[PDB]
């Protein structure tokens, strides 16, 4: 996921 509020994160594993 991103640095963001909300954190956006992709369908990977584990997600970032």
Known sequence: ???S???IC???I???
């Open 1 to 3: 996921c991103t640095k």
């Open 14 to 16: 584990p997600p970032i």
């Open 10 to 12: 992709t369908k990977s």
């Open 5 to 7: 509020i909300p954190p």
